[PDB]
Design a protein around this ligand. Structure first.
Ligand SMILES: Nc1ncnc2c1ncn2[C@@H]1O[C@H](COP(=O)(O)OP(=O)(O)OP(=O)(O)O)[C@@H](O)[C@H]1O
Ligand SMILES: Nc1ncnc2c1ncn2[C@@H]1O[C@H](COP(=O)(O)OP(=O)(O)OP(=O)(O)O)[C@@H](O)[C@H]1O
Ligand SMILES: [Mg+2]
Ligand SMILES: [Zn+2]
Lengths: 336, 310, 975
């Protein structure tokens, strides 16, 4: 199963608070890993939000396939007939879903299986405060290793071969960074009250931005990728873990009663939010579509992955809770 | 042939308890669970873990023989009281050592010696990860297995079958997927096969045999019990057996949902992996391989046992 | 068998209860106290052999010290001074800690003379000897009267012996209190057996020697058996409501007590060493069942006060008899299980399918269900045959032979050396007749036995269950009627129709889970029970115990909830109007619900009528009363199958009740949503019984004998670890019984909590939140106490796991979390408590701390109780946990206290209490190091050790972070 796979980028426009588990300080700690402690999004939540977006798009009928609009109302009768019109009532009764979502993003609550499995969103660039170069995208060598291991399964052509050259070792008090972050005169850079000596190297950042722009385009989520290169830093594993654990946005919130104009008793709590401008990557595994008299337009796996990439490229979607206060909006750029 | 599967994500293997119970736990991978993965891509010898940190090594479940201080326990019997106890040569009471033992350490282990560098703790191979608020009351908390950065699951299958070499396939509980590749037999199994003759000669000359269960085994004939039937040992060439001393853990209770009959499979009890039997055999062992299958469902990867001397 | 019971009586009463009063003619008083039942010369010799042997191997092998005299430390004080060398007044030493107590009241009642020791014909001894003889005659007369009344009461020798063993101490104590005084009787009962080594009282020695004689009668070889029914934690885990947990624990205790009762009936109540059956409520119930002693409900029987493991010492001629005993225990336990299963099958299962063909369809699986229920538990009876080492040679020859045998064991060096030292010290005495006994290595046998169990319980044998849908609750066994899913659903729907009080229709159970669910309604009509009364407690769900908090108005909402059904009136009259109004609202709601259910005609009318006085308290939660469907689901009915969720006209009284509940909250406060599960275990009981944690022999001998013996014996006793003996083991078990029966239920009831299981060291309770830390430290002190009042106590350390959780969390998840907390507390050292708050939304805290620190945390709660210190001082301090160092911790915390305290005295008090409390906190270092936790637990120059340590900064940071977490958890618990 799962003949093909695709890579989905995710850029956090606004802080994201996905899910909720030690919760030592934050009453609602972010969706976090266990072995490494990096921020992450469970495949279940990403699959849910993607399938909700697909269902809403199917209702709105803006899922143009091969530069041709996809009308599901005629398609369900064409492929099912008999009770298909009655099946339409099930969509009208909200007890089911349109056939495209049922055959791609999993079945309904009640036989079959989804054509795509949504993996976890692994972190790729973490924004941290810098003394110079106001904020910097920091990574870790094992982050690059995970990226390479994940990306060996899709691209392979020459990009996969050249990506194997990424192999670095960093001490707990050393880093490699661009010209913007390194302080003038002194050969050290300060991020989040941590001082690191710059290690002389001019290949790892170049290759990282090279592959990033290679399968994400020159336009790095609405910004020129060249400007990003000057503000890329790679730190040690422990340093990256500490950054991803303690550099998130801890925001204290309260509830005020209009009767007295003060904070309600027991209404103060701290919520942890994943920082904005955070690059994350997810793997979507697509297999052979379920044999249910599928149209020849998406008969093969290549067609369905193509239509998914086309309909989800440069998209905007909300993840996690706190949607009503402008939290969770991210931009997705499918890897072509 | 070894199917090396690196997990891109966490993995889930459902507990026997159902999950309106929102709480859910996780267990180690079961041979019936991994058998479905390979059959979706014949018999399965078993499955171990693999760690590729500079070098590539295979880890089996740590034997219950090994103690915390890496001290082997041997069953010695007192005729004055006529009772056999498992003495560690450093104390009369001991606890099993959790973790994993490498094949390069396993080859020496069957000779009665183990090195500190030949074992790996459980925290350095994988961990347990809890997720809460997954999906007003629909939220359910699920525990999963999070593997290390350079570790995964190796499935040891006899070289009599062939299929696609490399790809991605879905395994486990919830819809996850891992990247699988076909790797040839490493030098560890070759070294074990080469030293099998010497260790078998040692077993024959010493008149003592040790069975090490690297995989869970359903040894029950009519019901399900941990007792070792003498007929099974007699097949390998054991003329007679004097005493049997088995040490293991809590039996693993498991079942499954049979899609063919649309009904759950019968609940089965199996001897937990890592349990070791000590047998004072008579004669010699005629087995030409250092691994044998015991109990039922041996095709799916159950009851893989190694031979050892003491 | 009658002569066997009579000889058991003779062995038990082989020494008078006042033996230590005068050793010159103790045997004459022993013969007189029995009277017509006095033993013959051969029987007396056999009894003395079985007493010198075993009992206390340390005692007899030490009393024969011949250093120019044979020592004697009694109350007589008149002995042959030529070769006796009187010592002093007898004392009593704790068998574990060696704590020394004195008999002040006995000495005060006894005559007092200026001369310490009187010679054979000392001047002025006439009056003192006359008074001594008078008081001794009075004591003998009252003992004879008590024993004569006891013998006249009973005719059967077996019943007479069992009743004597059970109640002779109590009867003698009450008689002496009626004559002399309560204090005199209390001090007299606890008189030591062997005054030279008073590590156990006289009655413990009597029980031990009776067991020894029973194990060595008619040439039967003694054998030490240990029985364990496993697993236990998995069985207790599977639960949905607190009633299910109580039923599981009580059923397990009842099963192990059935095994214990069979053993005691076959041999004797004293043959069991652990648990100490005397004083056990289960034992009293069993005595009532035998019509031996009319049961008195002084101690509540609802508590599962019997552990899952029991140790006994019995005499068997051959291993065939041992196999017969094991088969008999299995037969008794399986007969009880089968009786319960058949009661459930022919009372509940056929109670709903008495006419339907589904009963006929499922009747083919009756044998399968019976087999899977019977074989659910694994029963292991590991027996060790006590070897009879030959001692025919001289003292040196016999000791050499015993040491050679011990060497021939071929054991690990440490235990072999320990037992060699024990034997050598036993051989350091000077006496021709000093010969080692076969029980001198008794502890060793026990140790091996335990190891055997740890292997023998590993085995298992489970039946081949058929194919079908598994049980919903347990999740491991095939559900009853599992051949067809639709058939199973219909059958369980019919069962819920017949039994809607407890079971839910969707809940498709198996044999074991159904038995657990319906056990409370069956125990009151079964053996042991049904004649004792008030066995099932009036608590079913964790909501009740969570609601058992004591508010500021001196009222517990559990009492008012019970008042809603009229069970107990409300004494307070200020809120009487609100109580009456809400009772009327509940009554009219119940009437409407009953009318609707009667219209549906799906449940028996008796259950619907009884729902008025047995309504669920979860409807009292306002959030749970959102709509009619929520009310129906909360009450225990599936509105989807009932179709009653469409009744939209039932919102007026719902809103009125919600408003009235808010009005009640106004001067009452909402029912608290949290409750504390606390489980505690003893610290290294196996090590303590191994003798590793036991003190040297000098700590278990008279205070004025170590200096009046040979130098070799002195140095050997000063540097050899004492080892337990059957008398000492019985004393330890009696102390454990005292702690587990006479103390823990008292503190739990005084703590307004519910104690579920109290067997020996282990304790399990559910408490209201602001009652847990109050009783945890008290129970830790009680367990660590050596001598409380004039009753023995274990005097050991404790590991505790406390989990503060919401009542909506699954029971088994909370149980597993609390067990994991206890395991972590044991992993981070011992004599400690692991506290964890699992808040509703996401929060989860931990703190593994020493007990003495916990009270310190309570102090800062006071500073937060009346806002003497701003709570934010915690949060800010948390921000420093990752940066604080040892040198400037005190000054920084002083700055924070001064900043956040209105008064400088408050700041100074906070600084002092924080500095003291943060010292004791267990840490979980990255490296596998436990020395730091050991230093923390004891209380030492730990500061200097950290100064020498190389990871001091990490240790202190973890300590302060854990202390702050504990403070926050406790403060949130208070509010
Ligand atoms: N009826 C009971 N109610 C509550 N707790 C009990 C009851 N009976 C025993 N326990 C306690 O529960 C625990 C379960 O004992 P158990 O024999 O399972 O030991 P274990 O350490 O969990 O492992 P193992 O099963 O290998 O002995 C023990 O601490 C025991 O004292
Ligand atoms: N007086 C006693 N006599 C015999 N057995 C006892 C006695 N008190 C307790 N036991 C048993 O000893 C066993 C102790 O096992 P447990 O798991 O508590 O280990 P431990 O050696 O006490 O130490 P720890 O629990 O701290 O590791 C239990 O099965 C308990 O029932
Ligand atoms: Mg213990
Ligand atoms: Zn069940």
């Amino acid at each position: 199963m799962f003949e093909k796979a695709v890579v989905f980028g995710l850029y956090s426009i606004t802080p994201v608070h996905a899910g909720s588990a030690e919760l030592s300080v934050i009453a609602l700690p972010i969706q976090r890993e266990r072995h490494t402690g990096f921020p992450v999004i469970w495949g279940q939540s990403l699959k849910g939000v993607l399938r909700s977006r697909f269902r809403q798009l199917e209702l709105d009928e803006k899922i143009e396939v091969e530069s041709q609009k996809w009308k599901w109302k005629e398609k369900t009768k064409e492929v099912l007939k008999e009770k298909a019109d009655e099946f339409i009532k099930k969509v009208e009764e909200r007890k089911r879903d349109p056939l495209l979502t049922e055959i791609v993003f999993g079945p309904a609550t009640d036989e079959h299986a989804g054509a795509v499995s949504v993996g976890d969103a692994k972190i790729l660039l973490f924004p941290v405060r810098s003394a110079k170069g106001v904020f910097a995208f920091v990574t870790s060598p094992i982050v690059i290793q995970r990226l390479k291991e994940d990306f060996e399964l899709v691209s392979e052509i020459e990009l996969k071969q050249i990506l194997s050259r990424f192999k670095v070792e960093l001490s707990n008090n050393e880093t490699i960074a661009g010209n913007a972050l390194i302080l003038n005169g002194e050969n050290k850079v300060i991020l989040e009250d941590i001082v690191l000596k710059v290690k002389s190297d001019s290949n790892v950042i170049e290759n990282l931005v090279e592959v990033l722009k290679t399968l994400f385009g020159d336009n790095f989520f609405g910004k020129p990728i060249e400007s990003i290169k000057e503000r890329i830093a790679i730190v040690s594993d422990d340093v990256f873990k500490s950054f991803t654990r303690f550099s998130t946005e801890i925001v204290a919130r309260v509830r005020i009663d209009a009767e007295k104009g003060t904070v309600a008793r027991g209404g103060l709590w701290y919520e942890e939010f994943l920082p904005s401008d955070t690059l994350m990557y997810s793997l979507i595994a697509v297999g052979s579509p379920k044999k249910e008299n599928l149209p020849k337009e998406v008969d093969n796996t290549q067609k369905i992955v193509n239509v998914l990439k086309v309909t989800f490229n440069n998209a905007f979607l909300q993840i996690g809770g706190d949607e009503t206060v402008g939290k969770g909006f991210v931009k997705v750029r499918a890897g072509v | 042939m070894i199917l090396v599967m690196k997990p891109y994500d966490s993995l889930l293997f459902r507990e026997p308890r159902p999950f309106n119970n929102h709480v859910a736990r996780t267990i180690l991978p079961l041979p019936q669970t991994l058998a479905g993965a390979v059959r979706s891509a014949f018999e399965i010898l078993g499955h171990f873990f693999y760690r590729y940190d500079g070098k590539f090594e295979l880890l089996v479940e740590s034997p219950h023989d090994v103690t915390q201080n890496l001290g082997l326990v041997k069953p010695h019997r007192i005729d004055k009281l006529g009772i056999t106890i498992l003495m560690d040569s450093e104390g009369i009471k001991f606890r099993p050592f959790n973790g994993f033992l490498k094949f390069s350490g396993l080859i020496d282990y069957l000779q009665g010696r183990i090195a500190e560098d030949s074992v790996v703790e459980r925290q350095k191979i994988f961990k347990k990860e809890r997720r809460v608020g997954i999906a007003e009351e629909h939220f359910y908390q699920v525990e999963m297995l999070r593997f290390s950065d350079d570790c995964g699951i190796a499935v040891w299958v006899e070289d009599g079958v062939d299929f696609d070499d490399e790809g991605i396939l879905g395994v486990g509980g919830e819809r996850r997927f891992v990247k699988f590749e076909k790797r040839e037999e490493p030098e560890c199994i070759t070294n074990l096969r080469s030293k099998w003759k010497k260790i078998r000669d040692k077993i024959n000359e010493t008149g003592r045999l040790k069975i090490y269960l690297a995989t869970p085994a359903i040894l029950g004939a009519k019901g399900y019990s941990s007792k070792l039937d003498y007929d099974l040992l007699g097949d390998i060439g054991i003329e007679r057996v004097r005493s049997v001393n088995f040490i293991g853990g809590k039996p693993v209770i498991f079942s499954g949902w049979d899609f063919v009959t649309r009904k759950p499979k019968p609940t089965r009890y199996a001897v937990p992996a890592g349990s070791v039997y000590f047998v004072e055999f008579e004669g010699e062992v005629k087995l030409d391989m250092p691994y044998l299958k015991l109990g039922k469902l041996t095709k799916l990867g159950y009851g893989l046992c190694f031979m050892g001397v003491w | 068998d009658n002569e066997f019971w009579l000889n058991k009586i003779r062995a038990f009463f082989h020494d008078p209860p006042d033996k230590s009063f005068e050793l010159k003619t103790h045997e004459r008083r022993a013969s007189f106290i029995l009277g017509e039942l006095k033993p013959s010369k051969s029987l007396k010799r056999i009894i003395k052999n079985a007493d010198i042997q075993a009992s206390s191997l340390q005692r007899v092998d030490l009393e024969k010290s011949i250093h120019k005299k044979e020592l004697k430390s009694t109350f007589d004080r008149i002995h042959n001074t030529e070769k006796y060398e009187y010592i002093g007044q007898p004392i009593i030493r704790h068998p574990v800690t060696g704590e020394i107590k004195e008999y002040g009241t006995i000495l005060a009642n006894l005559p007092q003379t200026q001369r310490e020791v009187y010679d054979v014909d000392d001047e002025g001894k006439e009056d003192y000897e006359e008074q001594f003889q008078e008081i001794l005659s009075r004591i003998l007369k009252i003992e004879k009267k008590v024993f004569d009344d006891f013998k006249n009461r009973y005719s059967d020798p077996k019943d007479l012996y069992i009743s004597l063993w059970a109640f002779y101490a109590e009867k003698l104590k009450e008689a002496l209190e009626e004559e002399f005084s309560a204090s005199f009787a209390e001090e007299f009962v606890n008189l030591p057996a062997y005054t030279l080594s008073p590590d156990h009282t006289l009655f413990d020695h009597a029980d031990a020697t009776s067991a020894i004689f029973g194990a060595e009668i008619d040439g039967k070889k003694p054998v030490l058996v240990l029985f364990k029914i496993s697993p236990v934690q998995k069985f207790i885990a599977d639960a949905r409501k607190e009633k299910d947990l109580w039923a599981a624990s009580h059923m397990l205790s009842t099963l192990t007590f059935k095994a214990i009762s069979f053993i005691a009936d076959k041999f004797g109540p004293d043959v069991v060493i652990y648990p100490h059956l005397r004083g056990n409520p289960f034992f009293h119930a069993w005595l009532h069942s035998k019509k031996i002693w009319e049961f008195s409900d002084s101690h509540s029987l609802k508590i599962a006060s019997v552990p899952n493991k029991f140790l006994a010492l019995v005499g068997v001629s051959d291993e065939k008899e041992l196999n017969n005993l094991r088969e008999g225990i299995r037969n008794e336990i399986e007969s009880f299980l089968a009786d319960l299963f058949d009661k459930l099958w022919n009372e509940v299962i056929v109670g709903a399918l008495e006419h339907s063909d589904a009963l006929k369809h499922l009747g083919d699986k009756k044998e399968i269900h019976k087999e899977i229920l019977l074989k659910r538990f694994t029963l292991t009876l590991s027996s060790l045959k006590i070897h009879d080492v030959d001692v025919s040679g001289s003292k040196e020859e016999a000791y050499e032979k015993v040491k050679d045998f011990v060497r021939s064991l071929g054991l690990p060096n440490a235990i072999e050396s320990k037992y060699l030292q024990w034997l050598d010290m036993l051989g350091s005495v000077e006496a021709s007749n000093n010969r080692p006994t076969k029980y001198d290595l008794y502890s060793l046998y026990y140790e091996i036995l335990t190891v055997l169990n740890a292997i023998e319980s590993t085995h298992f044998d489970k039946p081949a269950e058929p194919a079908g849908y598994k049980c919903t609750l347990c999740g491991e066994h095939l559900a009853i009627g599992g051949e067809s899913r639709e058939m199973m659903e219909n059958v369980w729907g019919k069962i819920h129709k017949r039994w809607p009080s407890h079971l839910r229709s969707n809940e498709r159970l198996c044999a074991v889970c159904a038995v657990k669910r319906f056990y409370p309604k069956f125990i009151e009509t079964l053996d042991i029970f049904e004649g004792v009364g008030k066995v099932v407690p009036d608590i079913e769900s964790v909501s009740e115990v969570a609601m058992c908090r004591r508010t500021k108005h001196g009222i517990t909402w559990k009492e008012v909830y019970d008042y809603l059904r009229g069970l107990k009136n409300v004494d307070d009259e200020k809120l009487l109007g609100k109580l009456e109004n809400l009772k009327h609202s509940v009554q009219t709601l119940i009437n409407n619900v009953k009318s609707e259910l009667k219209s549906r005609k799906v449940y028996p009318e008796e259950f619907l009528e009884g729902l008025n006085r047995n309504f669920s308290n979860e409807i009292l939660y306002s959030e749970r009363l959102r709509d009619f469907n929520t009310l129906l689901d909360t009450l225990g009915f599936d509105a989807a199958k009932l179709g009653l969720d469409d009744v939209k006209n039932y919102e007026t009284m719902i809103s009125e009740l919600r408003e009235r509940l808010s009005e009640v909250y106004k001067m009452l406060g909402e029912p608290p949503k949290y409750y504390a599960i606390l489980m505690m275990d003893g610290d290294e009981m196996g090590k303590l019984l191994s003798g590793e944690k036991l003190k040297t022999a000098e700590h278990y001998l008279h205070s004025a004998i170590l200096e009046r013996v040979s130098d070799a014996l002195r140095v050997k006793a000063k540097t050899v670890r004492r080892l337990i003996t059957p008398a000492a083991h019985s004393s330890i078990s009696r102390a454990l019984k005292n702690f587990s029966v006479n103390h823990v239920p008292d503190v739990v009831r005084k703590g307004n909590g519910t104690l579920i299981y109290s067997g020996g060291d282990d304790v399990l309770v559910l408490l209201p939140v602001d009652t847990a830390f109050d009783v945890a430290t008290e129970l830790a002190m009680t367990f660590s106490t050596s001598w409380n009042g004039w009753e023995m106590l274990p005097g050991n350390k404790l590991s505790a796991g406390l989990l503060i959780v919401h009542y909506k969390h699954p029971l088994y998840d909370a149980l597993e979390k609390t067990r994991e907390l206890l395991q972590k507390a044991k992993k981070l050292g011992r004599n400690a408590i692991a506290v964890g708050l699992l808040k509703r939304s996401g929060s989860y805290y931990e703190s593994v701390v020493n007990f003495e620190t916990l009270e310190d945390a309570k102090a800062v709660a006071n500073l937060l109780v009346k806002e003497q210190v701003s709570p934010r001082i915690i949060y800010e301090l948390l921000n420093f946990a990752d940066v604080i160092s040892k040198e400037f911790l005190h000054q920084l915390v002083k700055y924070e206290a001064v900043r956040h305290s209105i008064d400088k005295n408050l700041a100074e008090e906070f600084q002092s209490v924080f500095a003291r409390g943060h010292q004791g906190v267990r840490v979980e270092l990255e490296g596998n190091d436990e020395e730091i936790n050991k230093y923390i637990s004891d209380g030492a120059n730990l500061e200097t050790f950290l100064d020498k340590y190389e990871k001091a900064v990490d240790v202190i940071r973890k300590q302060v972070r854990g202390f702050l977490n504990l403070v926050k958890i406790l403060y949130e618990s208070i509010r």
